[PDB]
Design a protein around this ligand. Sequence first.
Ligand SMILES: Nc1ccn([C@H]2C[C@H](O)[C@@H](COP(=O)(O)OP(=O)(O)OP(=O)(O)O)O2)c(=O)n1
Ligand SMILES: OC[C@H]1O[C@@](CO)(O[C@H]2O[C@H](CO)[C@@H](O)[C@H](O)[C@H]2O)[C@@H](O)[C@@H]1O
Ligand SMILES: [Ca+2]
Lengths: 415, 553
Amino acid sequence: PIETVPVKLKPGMDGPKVKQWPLTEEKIKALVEICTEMEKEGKISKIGPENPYNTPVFAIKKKDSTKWRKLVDFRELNKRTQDFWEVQLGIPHPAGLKKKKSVTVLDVGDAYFSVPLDEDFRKYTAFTIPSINNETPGIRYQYNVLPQGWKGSPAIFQSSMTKILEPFKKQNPDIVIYQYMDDLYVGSDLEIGQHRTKIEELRQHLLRWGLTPFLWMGYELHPDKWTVQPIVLPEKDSWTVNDIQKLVGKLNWASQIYPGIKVRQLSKLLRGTKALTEVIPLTEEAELELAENREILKEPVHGVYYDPSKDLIAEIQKQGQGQWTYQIYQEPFKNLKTGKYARMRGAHTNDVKQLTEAVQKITTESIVIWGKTPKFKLPIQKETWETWWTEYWQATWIPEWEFVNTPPLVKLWYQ
Amino acid sequence: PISPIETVPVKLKPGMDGPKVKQWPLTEEKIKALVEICTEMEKEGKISKIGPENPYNTPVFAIKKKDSTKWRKLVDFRELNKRTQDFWEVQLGIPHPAGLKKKKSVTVLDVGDAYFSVPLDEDFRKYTAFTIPSINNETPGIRYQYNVLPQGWKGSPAIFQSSMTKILEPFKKQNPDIVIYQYMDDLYVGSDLEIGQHRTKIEELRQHLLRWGLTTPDKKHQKEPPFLWMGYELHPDKWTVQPIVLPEKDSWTVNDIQKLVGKLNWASQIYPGIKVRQLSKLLRGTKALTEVIPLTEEAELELAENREILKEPVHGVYYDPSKDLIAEIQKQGQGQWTYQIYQEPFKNLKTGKYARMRGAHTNDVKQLTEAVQKITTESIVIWGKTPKFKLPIQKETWETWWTEYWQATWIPEWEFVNTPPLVKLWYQLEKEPIVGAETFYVDGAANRETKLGKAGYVTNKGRQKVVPLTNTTNQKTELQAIYLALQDSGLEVNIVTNSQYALGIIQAQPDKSESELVNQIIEQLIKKEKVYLAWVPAHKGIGGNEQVDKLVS
DNA sequence: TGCCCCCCCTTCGGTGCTTTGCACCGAAGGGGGGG
Ligand SMILES: Nc1ccn([C@H]2C[C@H](O)[C@@H](COP(=O)(O)OP(=O)(O)OP(=O)(O)O)O2)c(=O)n1
Ligand SMILES: OC[C@H]1O[C@@](CO)(O[C@H]2O[C@H](CO)[C@@H](O)[C@H](O)[C@H]2O)[C@@H](O)[C@@H]1O
Ligand SMILES: [Ca+2]
């Protein structure tokens, strides 16, 4: 007896028509078991080829999780679904969530299955489960309730969500709660023991609605301990000709961000035509230029601030030895945040795992800090990334990415 | 009494009406054979005759079946297909025998007139109108509309293919001991039952399909091996492809070469070591489909090498899920790679080859990674898991590559196999400048209008050179200037350029390239013992960079 | 002189940085195969 919220597409756009990519045996077995149980419970229904729309589907396992989790690559549908900020169903972003000492993430996506979907919109949620060795043609399904991973599911359900959270937000007014896609970010400044206690209260607080992948898992963040990676000039005494050449190349690049950087008195040290390993002293005018340039790299970049109407963009640089640097920006050279990762899972043996782990780490930070997911510039070939990333993905969301190939002519973010 | 096959709702694209294409002239031999087949469809109820209220029409023709005495009726629905709604094809790929598991009982079935046994959408039959001449357009003739799925409509395969699954769905759930490979009307049914209990379930399936209007004639019913399935031959323990016909024509046209490479690619799934590089290299160019090409010395030898492979009959084995999958790749040279997938030694499940040349400058390590990725996708399609790899590359060679590459690259669980030729990096750039090596400050320049340019270097020991170049670009001179530094330097040399373009190519350690200049640079680097490359910005008064930029500009 | 799917090889035009040359890529047209 619940009326369905009518949903339209962006005018001038069709539905998603993305082909299903091959799936491993263990993921197909997980999906068939899940798509059979969801068919018994009427949450999904079989369709035919007359539905011209399709969206990829596969399964994942979250961190320290042993049971599979269905994940649908709704990236094409979300881009083509009407932005619910125009419908005013958008969720405001609390600027204090990044200031809490602890933030627990809860997968509340299972509650979306209780709300029906607009009938005229169900044809856009079509997906196809493949078969191993193409034994069976595509078994196509579509959604009848709010699907997990669609950007409209938390927007429609937010009206119901604000009611379920009312008693807990009033008994604990210092706890900040943010909702993004299937996740619920709960942040407090309490002790870790009292934080997890309030988290367990929030779980049992949701069970009181469940009676009237699962909710038991939670992942602890600490945004107050997040640090940034600035551009740094190395400290040396005996600079070789090649040392100053690399430094001048680095400073010249950095001048695109810090316009006060000068290199006139350092370039004149490279006046002659000397061997790369010849040690040269630092002139008096060059000593001040290097010291003055370090001070410019200390102060912040002028005029950098987050525009909520602009897309976030993230670049990543593979530095080797398990080191990975990244920068989040909206306009070029106006970086909102720079950082570095190290000793991630897969260090010194699997790059694709680390890059997949770093994309998840960056995306999680962008959700906590701005409530958005950035578009990634991944330092990897297209086929290399498309072959393995699904084997190491552990999140319920999937960011947008393009592929780049920029050799490191100037080691800029890491010495 | 047969249960109705539920009609699939079919629409046209918005704001589009049905087709009106009339009919092209047809020869009398075809017009006569058509009226006989159409009368058979009126008898069985597959085609209605009434349509004076129907302004639509689609052209019709007829070609014979493959090596059969029966003509096949086809309708050119290309105008209807443009105006019909889009379908999502449920056919995602082709089944392969190397993914089959051995069974004790096997049967092959084929539904008769399969498209004509599924009721078309009621409101859509008006747009399937078509005319046929009675006697050379002397009299008007018989008009008809399709009451079932026709042949030539873009939705006919997908509709029948999904409808076939709905009919088999209750049978497969109530018989989990059975495996059914459905591909259009072709049906492969295998089980580990007594082949008598198999014949029972097969007849149960024959009646169950006959309970929805799908006939299974005995002419297409295969009960005894070898089972001709998907263009293969299925024996109880092994499988092989149906025989391959190589055209032995002594005057090769472009279309002959295209047919040759196509059949070699098809045979390369089970016949190991098939090459098509030198043969397809004859095909490159803007030549017409009929131009005669003389086979080059390398292409004739490569064609002879393929003849030797296809002389001996080769077979594959079936998939045992209890054993691991093994994939072993061999380098064939000139960017060619073959591989075999097996579970027990010398018993290949299937073979294949990767000869794709992506990028203007590459090396064997990249091509091997691309080959591993092609195998991984293929294996997950066929068996749903990634095979253990046996690669002709040493662990130290791979570790040196992926740790130092700026891009993220990775190969799954793999072990080294000493099967020459081995894949290796032919040179490696030092990370730090070389003490005691001459430092070559290098630069080039070219005029955008005259296409003239100069390229040269200046070293710390006083050595200099400038060379004028004609019909050149800024990028070529920058490459040409590095080439001069490599030629006139000792075994160890430091090279400082300002060319981001040239430095990006060389730092990727290519061993092969489409550019004659890059290859000569590669040849020089392999001769060297220590090479250090460094980049500095231009027009900043740096070292010899300002000195050499003036000499070239 | 039809339809749908998969594969490889070559060509060609669009796209974005190596920049107005050069490189990459997806579409398309040739072939093979299946029903
Ligand atoms: N050149 C071809 C061959 C086949 N098919 C499609 C339409 C057929 O319905 C289906 C199955 O092919 P068959 O040769 O088995 O034809 P029917 O199954 O149509 O006839 P038969 O009684 O010979 O089995 O494949 C097609 O469109 N074009
Ligand atoms: O890796 C990109 C790859 O994915 C495809 C299909 O899987 O498209 C998906 O990814 C795109 C890149 O973000 C999205 O734009 C798109 O919505 C999503 O379906 C292919 O297009 C592409 O080859
Ligand atoms: Ca048939």
